[PDB]
TrEMBL record, chain A:
This is Major capsid protein. It comes from the Viruses. It comes from Mycobacterium phage Ogopogo.
UniProtKB/TrEMBL annotation, chain B:
This is Major capsid protein. It comes from Mycobacterium phage Ogopogo. The chain holds residues 157 to 208 of 312 of the full protein. The lineage of its organism: Viruses, Duplodnaviria, Heunggongvirae, Uroviricota, Caudoviricetes.
Amino acid sequence: MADLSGVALGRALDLIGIHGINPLTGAALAGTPPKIIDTTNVVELTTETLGLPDQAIEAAVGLVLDDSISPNGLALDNSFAFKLATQRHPTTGQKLYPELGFGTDISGFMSLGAAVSDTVRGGPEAVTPSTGAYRTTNPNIKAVVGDFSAFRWGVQANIPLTLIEYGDPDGSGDLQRKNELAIRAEVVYGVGILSTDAFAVVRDA
Amino acid sequence: PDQAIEAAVGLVLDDSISPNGLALDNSFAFKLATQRHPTTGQKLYPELGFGT
Amino acid sequence: AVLKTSSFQLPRHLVPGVWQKAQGQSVLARLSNAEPQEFGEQQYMTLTAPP
Amino acid sequence: RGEVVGESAEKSESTATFAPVTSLVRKVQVTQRFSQEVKWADESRQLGVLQT
């Protein structure tokens, strides 16, 4: 449980910065804040472009470049990263990108640095069945391309993992009344986007 | 056979577990080891011998 | 009748450790470097149009 | 899961959940039966049958 608290604070940076959602309930954050997926640089997968992941990444790069910004990074949904890594040559049937393995840990692709996670889909969080922002209509974000220097962030303050013994810290009822305990950790991120044009997304909707 | 083994790894990864091993029926292991390149007709995996 | 371990109702052995499915990590923490920041809103200067 | 909170928004809880899983235990036996005359044949001729 102590270990799992830290990775939940880590994952939140992507749900905030990419999707603009509160990770717990999965609903959109209330201010309509700047989010990477605000970008009009969308490439939409049609049933013919679907099954060609590398051609979707290059199309998305091309939109960042004709906004006069040079991309340096790529983010992939781990499912689409597998579909890229296993992409077959359309007549010889060989793998196009054998160095990608099963696509679980793609460190770089084309000229770009890369990272891969389910958070790029919005994770399980965005489809939370009662309240998640994508539970009914889902913009299926497969990948994000951009100048990731244009997303600016840092840890402004941190509260390390600590034990709560008293009061009702979550609304469920008092800890001493119920002979319970809680552990809490917190972090506060500054986040800012210098242009939405610095980013393009690969999506299916 | 290789695209079927690949397709099965895809299912384990989309359940968020990383597969480490493969178990083969000896008849299917032979069909894999003798699989031919679709335009050149050469063996894809000549290093597998008879697949035993 | 023959005596069998069925009659003893023996408890199961607990095995150490927890089995877990892995969690996808932050992409933004790897694609964008963290800048040192003081607590509060930051402001950044942008060029809107060239001469 | 993490939750995003305002300056005095009410903080909520989200906790790990666990479940156990259980083994079975299985006993396997092989028994092979032969005549005394086979043991004498094998050990006098060196047939190797009982080693196989």
